[PDB]
Amino acid sequence: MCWVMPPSVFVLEYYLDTLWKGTMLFIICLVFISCNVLREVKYQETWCFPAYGMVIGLWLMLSSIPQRRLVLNHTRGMYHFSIQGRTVCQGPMHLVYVRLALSSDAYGGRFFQLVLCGHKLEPLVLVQLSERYEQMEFLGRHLARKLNINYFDYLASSYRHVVRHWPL
Amino acid sequence: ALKSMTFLLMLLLIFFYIFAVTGVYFFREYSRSTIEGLEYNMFFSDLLNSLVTVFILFTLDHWYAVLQDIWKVPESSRVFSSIYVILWLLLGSIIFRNIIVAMMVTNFQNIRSELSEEMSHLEVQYKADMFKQQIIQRRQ
Amino acid sequence: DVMEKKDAWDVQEFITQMYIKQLLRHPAFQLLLAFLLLSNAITIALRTNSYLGQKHYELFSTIDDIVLTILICEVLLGWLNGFWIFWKDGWNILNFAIVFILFMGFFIKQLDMVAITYPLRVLRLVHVCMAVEPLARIIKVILQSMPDLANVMALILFFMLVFSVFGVTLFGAFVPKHFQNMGVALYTLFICITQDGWLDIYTDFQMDEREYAMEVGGAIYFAVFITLGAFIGLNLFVVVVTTNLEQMMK
Amino acid sequence: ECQAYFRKVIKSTFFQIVMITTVTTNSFLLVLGTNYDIQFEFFRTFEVSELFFVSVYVCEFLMKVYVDPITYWKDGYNILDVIILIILTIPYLLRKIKGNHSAYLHFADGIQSLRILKLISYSRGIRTLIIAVGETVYTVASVLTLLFLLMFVFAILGFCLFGVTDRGDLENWGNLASAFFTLFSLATVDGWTDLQEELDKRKFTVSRAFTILFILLASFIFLNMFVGVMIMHTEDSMKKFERDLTLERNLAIMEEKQIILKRQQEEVNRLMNTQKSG
Amino acid sequence: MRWRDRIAVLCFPPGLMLTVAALILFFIHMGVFASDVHNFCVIHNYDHMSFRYTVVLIFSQVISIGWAAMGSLYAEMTGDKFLRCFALTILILNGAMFFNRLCLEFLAINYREER
Ligand SMILES: CC(C)CCC[C@@H](C)[C@H]1CC[C@H]2[C@@H]3CC=C4C[C@@H](O)CC[C@]4(C)[C@H]3CC[C@]12C
């Protein structure tokens, strides 16, 4: 998968995983419907909990998405925010970045995620592996070899991060 | 190591002294009680008997049976005496056991440290002797 | 860098930053939670007494509900940051299990009784108190030391089995009721390994043939085995303790 | 004004010798006071000596009532001795002349033992040992709190296992104080056999398993964690002290060598100057 | 943007909808409160009063309260006073209605069942 995805010939496409949550909510409710707990001795009926689950699952299922795409085509592309049907966000550079973000718990354990920053863009969350730092800017250089724009790091500029397009 | 045991035995005997002479007149209602059925009355009776019984508590053998035999005293809400003897036995036993094992471990540590520095010195002396032997061979 | 205008994910990370800023870094909220938990601990210590519980049972039920709802609120707030990180944690699993068992026994009928309600509360007391620093190092090194304790325990038990064969050859139906039953025999051997008050056992097998008999042999074999095993166990315990504690000192 | 002379007097060894002599005679008074005859008869010597001792201790508190309590409020041994003086002075003020409502006598030998503790407050070698072992107070407090939490956990477990059912086992896992004392006994080695014979007759077969699990947790963990913690705390405390002492000795050695080198250079320069001028 | 298209599809803009859901929760809970009061005062038909659904609509109450709060927090950064006033008014009315129903249920306690 290491040499398949970072090349990313021309455009990239992206989706959301909320359909998984909607399908799981539907499965859980359909389990809850037939032969649930019989708590009439509790002087109550708990059908409204799966009813509210159905409201939530139906609303989450309504979040349809055709293949969130940009103009990351390996050219002088505008990085115009593209969706099958409607289009919203357009900007001449200086907005599409890739930024490393950090999160901490009460203990102090650090979790590292990555986000393609821009006007209502999609993130670049990696597949469930953030305990060590590894290589940092190697995938950043791969993104640069794609269509070099930015590779931002945490906190301010300082050092250890590279920029390619600036608006001054 | 017993040469190094210069102040720990003094503190041990002085803590023994103060706690024993304190605990003479604490369970003063035990030996000086007119209960016919009792078998540990002579433990707290005399000062030397008090020394013997607090050494027994220091060794921590049958402290449960001892306390159950002092439970035959009229229970005065156990507010000062039971907590005093329990704190004495636990604090003395754990503190002095830990301090003596720590001191003997430190004795072994410094014995091995002196050994380590001594073969270190022997090795650098041997290396210097080898270098001076090469110097003597070259000078000839 | 300059960050002329923030985006949606910067907003989300900022919101999570304020979410972890409170109740995770603020000493006031943790202090209030510790105060409430110490108060219900005091009420726990006020139990074992019906003379107090007759005017306190309704208040005990109310404070039970209060501590349960603040516990589940804390668990929900922890789940807000993500179910994956809360499920994949070394210690949050324990608090989740504690609140799950307590709430399952509370809302649904259960045979859990006080023997579940109170120990779970004091487990939560411990889990709150270790978060405040000056016992966290000691509990951390205790849980670091236990995997090295495991091998010593396993070796001790295996040696005690392979010597309990020699034991049970002279056990059962004679000097009985503590050397019989092959597991009560094992646990009586363990009692003697703990090395306190075996003179009852010494008088138990006393007077076999009143001078030597096997009164010499079995007693001396078992006694030298007991003293060797007790020394080995106590040593191996303290040395594993100091070995895993040297990892702390590094 | 006269504070310099007063501090010079308090630095003199004669006042400390008089103080040590008075409290050693107090120790001998306690030695003779644990007897019964000299406790109340042939006791005029006891009366006059005790008056002398309380006069001396009042004088010591008068020396320690100065502005130096700006240092007797943050320090180590110093707060200990002034608090010892306070908890000495108040009770025998309400005991020797009591005239009050009180239960009975349990703090005569205790007060005299506090005076013996004030005797042992000297001996600077013991002070250095106390300094070397005083950083373990936080550690032993933390392990004591861990012991108390585990004791509370198994206290409520034992009450709910053997005291709630109310079919026996009373005053062992029954009343809370007796339950706590039995748990402290069971976490040690003492009294486990008789308690085991007591508990197995209450129709609870798993009680033996629970008790042996409790022993193999509590006794081993408490004893061995305590001995390891204190062993390496003492080792790391003495390692830095010995290293600092050797560093000071080395610094003195190099200073002496530098003094010798400077003296040799001065002698060589003087000899050269006398040879030139001669 | 094309609110048009905003309201178009695939999903929708930020939060909002999640705030107006608390509104329709307020509508249905106000209707249930009105039915409860109406059956308590005049008709006296405790057979069909909402004695039966007791804890599940309280859970609906609390999730609606949390939802209105989270919507207010997630909609405050737009920098516009009208949205903040909208969300805060909805939060205030939901809290008032929750406290009102809590008082009502605590009052009518001798009328459900006994434990
Ligand atoms: C599921 C989520 C959206 C919460 C909505 C809860 C709805 C479905 C619940 C809560 C209030 C409920 C009603 C409350 C009162 C009445 C009258 C009573 O005599 C029978 C039940 C009946 C007719 C209930 C039907 C279901 C109901 C409308």
Short mmCIF file of C-alpha atoms in Angstrom, two decimals, chain C residues 137-151 237 240-248, chain D residues 221 225:
data_model
loop_
_atom_site.label_atom_id
_atom_site.label_comp_id
_atom_site.label_asym_id
_atom_site.label_seq_id
_atom_site.Cartn_x
_atom_site.Cartn_y
_atom_site.Cartn_z
CA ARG C 137 5.27 6.02 40.82
CA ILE C 138 4.87 3.23 43.39
CA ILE C 139 1.73 1.80 41.77
CA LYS C 140 3.45 2.05 38.37
CA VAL C 141 6.46 0.09 39.57
CA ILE C 142 4.21 -2.46 41.31
CA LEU C 143 2.50 -3.19 37.99
CA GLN C 144 5.93 -3.20 36.32
CA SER C 145 7.21 -5.70 38.91
CA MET C 146 4.31 -8.19 38.81
CA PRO C 147 5.24 -9.80 35.41
CA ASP C 148 8.64 -10.60 36.93
CA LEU C 149 6.84 -11.89 40.02
CA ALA C 150 4.91 -14.32 37.80
CA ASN C 151 7.89 -16.51 36.87
CA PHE C 237 10.46 -11.99 46.16
CA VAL C 240 12.56 -9.36 42.00
CA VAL C 241 11.23 -6.29 43.84
CA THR C 242 14.62 -4.56 43.85
CA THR C 243 15.36 -5.68 40.27
CA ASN C 244 12.18 -4.11 38.89
CA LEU C 245 12.67 -1.07 41.15
CA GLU C 246 16.12 -0.43 39.66
CA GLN C 247 14.21 0.05 36.40
CA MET C 248 12.38 2.89 38.18
CA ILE D 221 3.63 -7.28 48.38
CA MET D 225 8.03 -3.73 48.33
#
